[PDB]
Amino acid sequence: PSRAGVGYDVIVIGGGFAGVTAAREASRSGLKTLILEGRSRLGGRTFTSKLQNQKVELGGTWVHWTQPNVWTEIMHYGLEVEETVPETVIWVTEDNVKRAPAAEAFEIFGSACNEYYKEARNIYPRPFEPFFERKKLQHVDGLSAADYLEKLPLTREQKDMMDSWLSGNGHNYPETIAYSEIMRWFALSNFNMPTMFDSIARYKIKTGTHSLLEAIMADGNSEVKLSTPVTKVNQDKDKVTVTTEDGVFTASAVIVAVPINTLHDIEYSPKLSAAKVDMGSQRHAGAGVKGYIRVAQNVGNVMTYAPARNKLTPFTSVFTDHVDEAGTLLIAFSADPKLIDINDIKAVEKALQPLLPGVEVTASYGYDWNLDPFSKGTWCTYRPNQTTRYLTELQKREGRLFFAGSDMANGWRGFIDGAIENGREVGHQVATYLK
Ligand SMILES: Cc1cc2nc3c(=O)[nH]c(=O)nc-3n(C[C@H](O)[C@H](O)[C@H](O)COP(=O)(O)OP(=O)(O)OC[C@H]3O[C@@H](n4cnc5c(N)ncnc54)[C@H](O)[C@@H]3O)c2cc1C
Numbered sequence: 001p002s003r004a005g006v007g008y009d010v011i012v013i014g015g016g017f018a019g020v021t022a023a024r025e026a027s028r029s030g031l032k033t034l035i036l037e038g039r040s041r042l043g044g045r046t047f048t049s050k051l052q053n054q055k056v057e058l059g060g061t062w063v064h065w066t067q068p069n070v071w072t073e074i075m076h077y078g079l080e081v082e083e084t085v086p087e088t089v090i091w092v093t094e095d096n097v098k099r100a101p102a103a104e105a106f107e108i109f110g111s112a113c114n115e116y117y118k119e120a121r122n123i124y125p126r127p128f129e130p131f132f133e134r135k136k137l138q139h140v141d142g143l144s145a146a147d148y149l150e151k152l153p154l155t156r157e158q159k160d161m162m163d164s165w166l167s168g169n170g171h172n173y174p175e176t177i178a179y180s181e182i183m184r185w186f187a188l189s190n191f192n193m194p195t196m197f198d199s200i201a202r203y204k205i206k207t208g209t210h211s212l213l214e215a216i217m218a219d220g221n222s223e224v225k226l227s228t229p230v231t232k233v234n235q236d237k238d239k240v241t242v243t244t245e246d247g248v249f250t251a252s253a254v255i256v257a258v259p260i261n262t263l264h265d266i267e268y269s270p271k272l273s274a275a276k277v278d279m280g281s282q283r284h285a286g287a288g289v290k291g292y293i294r295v296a297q298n299v300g301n302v303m304t305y306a307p308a309r310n311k312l313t314p315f316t317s318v319f320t321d322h323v324d325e326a327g328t329l330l331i332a333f334s335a336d337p338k339l340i341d342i343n344d345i346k347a348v349e350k351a352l353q354p355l356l357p358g359v360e361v362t363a364s365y366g367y368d369w370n371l372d373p374f375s376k377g378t379w380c381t382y383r384p385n386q387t388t389r390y391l392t393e394l395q396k397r398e399g400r401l402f403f404a405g406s407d408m409a410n411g412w413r414g415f416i417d418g419a420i421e422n423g424r425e426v427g428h429q430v431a432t433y434l435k
Pocket of ligand 1: 015046058259262369378379419
């Protein structure tokens with residue numbers, strides 16, 4: 001390392017895409033760098049695994065060239081993408097089920113989106129520059145997704161389809177999710193609903209998200225310690241002392257790249273600013289269910305919508321991954337784990353009956369990101385007021401403590417792309433700070 005009295009120039013706490021991108025950035029600047037990771041693996045809220053004979057993504061999955069950082073890195077390393085999924089759309093409204101060819105359902109849904117998203121260009125004309133229209137964003141940031149929904153002249157059917165979509169975006173009940181965050185997704189999709197569909201659930205890395213993570217790691221020169229939860233971070237004038245459950249490590253600068261819902265799992269000295277305290281106490285809105293379901297039947301390429309609260313089914317959305325000769329692989333989301341145990345095959349089979357009657361579930365699994373102490377929640381969509389109250393102060397360095405993550409990115413906050421974007425600029429600021 002450069003200076004005396006430290007073990008490292010840079011310690012990165014957390015080895016998701018954000019921490020790994022920051023550690024590549026720091027170590028390729030010639031800084032002696034260590035990643036401290038609490039789990040037995042790198043990847044964080046991305047986790048490539050297996051379900052039956054299928055390679056699956058238990059967390060973060062889909063990517064697009066609307067996402068500058070992850071698309072840059074995909075091409076950087078010569079990786080390929082393939083496609084997930086629609087023929088028919090099934091939706092619940094007033095606790096009744098309808099189905100129709102996809103284009104007909106999209107006539108109703110798109111007309112609703114036309115109304116729901118009409119202010120997005122006014123609030124985020126530069127989506128990677130959150131506060132370019134600070135005052136207009138401030139005017140609406142108090143609104144939840146449900147609040148804005150109740151202001152619109154839509155049919156109940158249109159409102160029910162939006163409820164499904166909005167709940168799907170934030171992974172929670174619509175009243176918990178910032179309306180402005182809904183506008184952000186649309187703005188990042190170039191104010192075009194088909195581009196939004198393509199960006200958030202279509203293309204995936206052929207060799208898995210883990211192949212990109214390892215490419216980034218292998219391009220750096222950083223050390224790694226796995227299965228090493230950090231318990232204390234202590235900063236003085238000259239260095240940072242990081243206490244873990246298996247060793248003490250010092251650095252001239254530390255990048256805290258943990259999910260914001262786990263900020264209070266670490267003990268900090270001096271204490272952190274009110275923005276970190278409040279965000280870590282309030283959490284972002286992402287707290288739902290994601291699972292993979294195997295049904296014996298061939299149901300084709302379906303996509304389903306249902307409100308977060310309905311009498312028929314706990315799933316806000318179910319859609320075909322691919323059809324097979326063992327049946328259909330479905331992907332299913334719910335707003336609330338209390339509504340369905342995604343690993344209970346019988347519970348799940350009953351949950352699907354209103355949408356795909358007679359279907360037989362042979363396998364069902366979802367990773368529990370909510371109870372995993374190293375995530376405590378799913379992807380990050382802010383709650384009302386959080387963007388304008390906390391984003392900038394959340395991003396800020398405090399002495400020798402820097403902060404990184406998709407949970408605080410400027411652009412595709414809540415996505416793999418946001419983690420890489422934020423990790424790369426924070427790692428560069430650290431390199432600059434260390435001169
Ligand atoms: C179910 C689900 C599906 C998703 N699907 C998509 C998708 O399709 N497309 C998309 O773009 N994004 C998706 N996302 C979002 C994406 O997965 C995340 O935004 C991203 O992976 C997180 O990057 P990060 O490095 O900022 O955070 P994390 O991956 O959470 O990095 C945090 C890391 O730090 C570690 N850590 C935490 N606390 C400590 C501690 N005290 N000591 C040591 N280590 C610690 C954690 O174990 C973890 O390895 C999804 C998220 C979820 C939950």
